[PDB]
Amino acid sequence: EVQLVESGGCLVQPGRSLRLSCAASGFTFDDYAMHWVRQAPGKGLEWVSAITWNSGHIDYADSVEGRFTISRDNAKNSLYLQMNSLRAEDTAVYYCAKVSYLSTASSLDYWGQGTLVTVSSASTKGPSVFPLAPSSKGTAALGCLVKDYFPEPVTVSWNSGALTSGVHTFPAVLQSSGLYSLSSVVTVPSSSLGTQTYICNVNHKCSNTKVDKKVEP
């Protein structure tokens, strides 16, 4: 079981420079070329950078030359991407990816899950969580409202993740204010509504905040 964990990047100011890390394990790191591929929110994959196992050759995309630098610490089974002169439009999810075989002319067969980097002068704000309690409106529906936060993203689980059936967590949508807002809702058997406790767990990594609202009829 090969796994690649990216980290480091949250909010970063234009012009300034952030460094993404990708510790890897579950295969011999010394052997495979590594890549960085990035995906702009609501846009395609884009290939950022590449590096041979022994750091001995390197390529960047034109979008990236002169600002980013790929690098790797084979001893600490880790892969880096120093990102300098960050533009507003560098905002994307950033994946690292192992190569199929002992060759650079080779596909990307495991991908990390990818850290979101946001490039903006604005300031981070934790979200107000509000209960969407079930009323009139066989089954009934209840949920949470995750209002006015920045930057992306938040994670919503229900009853600490034990509740999964029939959950919709919507895509966050940016407001006039410049903050994101969010709704996470469940269909429930109404029978349980007076006996079953439903709690949503919001968790905004970039503002260190974490909240657990309990929804009641």
Binding site: A105, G114, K137, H168, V173
Partner: protein
């Protein structure tokens, strides 16, 4: 140094054969991988060497071409094949990804479950009052949601969201969120969304009267 996937989108029904192409501007040769990316997940390698297939990936994903014009085929679309698909060259840098190709499964019409939520007292203590109308599990994806406060049909002050098509049953869920400040919300009483959808014989209006 450039690769053109075609077409951009395609809504196929279950069982169908679906073909995506990928046109390299140089001579990739056998050197082409095909990537599947499911909604809000990383990508997965389906095909490499333009024609070889990664372990455990289903026989139904099959790609071909050599050199310059390439072509991925899904010989019998299942419901979980609603992803986005990418091609990529890897002879030599730049390992360019194709424009993408989103694929939407096409099921029979399904009307939507509709719920409505007045603002929490929690939120009114904080000055603004947003009303949420939910559209629960439907197809096709489009539906007109229309807000009306005291029948005055509101305009410009509500925003929708929409979930990705379900990998199981290929249905969408939408949320429209009307957003007023405590003072606007406190004047009117009759608060309503009304939903038009293809699966609906006539429009639905769930509503509440307080504020």
């Amino acid at each position: 140094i450039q690769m053109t996937q075609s077409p951009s989108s395609l809504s196929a029904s279950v069982g169908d054969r679906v073909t995506i192409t990928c046109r390299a501007s140089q001579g990739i040769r056998n050197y082409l991988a095909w990537y599947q990316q499911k909604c809000g997940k990383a990508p997965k390698l389906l095909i490499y060497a333009a024609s070889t297939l990664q372990s455990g990936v289903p026989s139904r994903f099959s790609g071909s071409g050599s050199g310059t014009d390439f072509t991925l085929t899904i010989s019998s679309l299942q419901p979980e094949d609603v992803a986005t698909y990418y091609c990529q060259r890897y002879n030599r840098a730049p390992y360019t990804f194709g424009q993408g190709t989103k694929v939407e499964i096409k099921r029979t019409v399904a009307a939507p479950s509709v719920f409505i939520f007045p603002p929490s007292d929690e939120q009114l203590k904080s000055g603004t009052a947003s009303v949420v109308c939910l559209l629960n599990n439907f197809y096709p994806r489009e539906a007109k949601v229309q807000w009306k406060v005291d029948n005055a049909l509101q305009s410009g002050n509500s925003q929708e969201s929409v979930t990705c098509q379900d990998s199981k049953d290929s249905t969408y869920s939408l949320s429209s969120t009307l957003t007023l400040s405590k003072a606007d919300y406190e004047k009117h009483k009759v608060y309503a969304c009304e939903v038009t959808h293809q699966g609906l014989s006539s429009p639905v209006t769930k509503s509440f009267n307080r504020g």
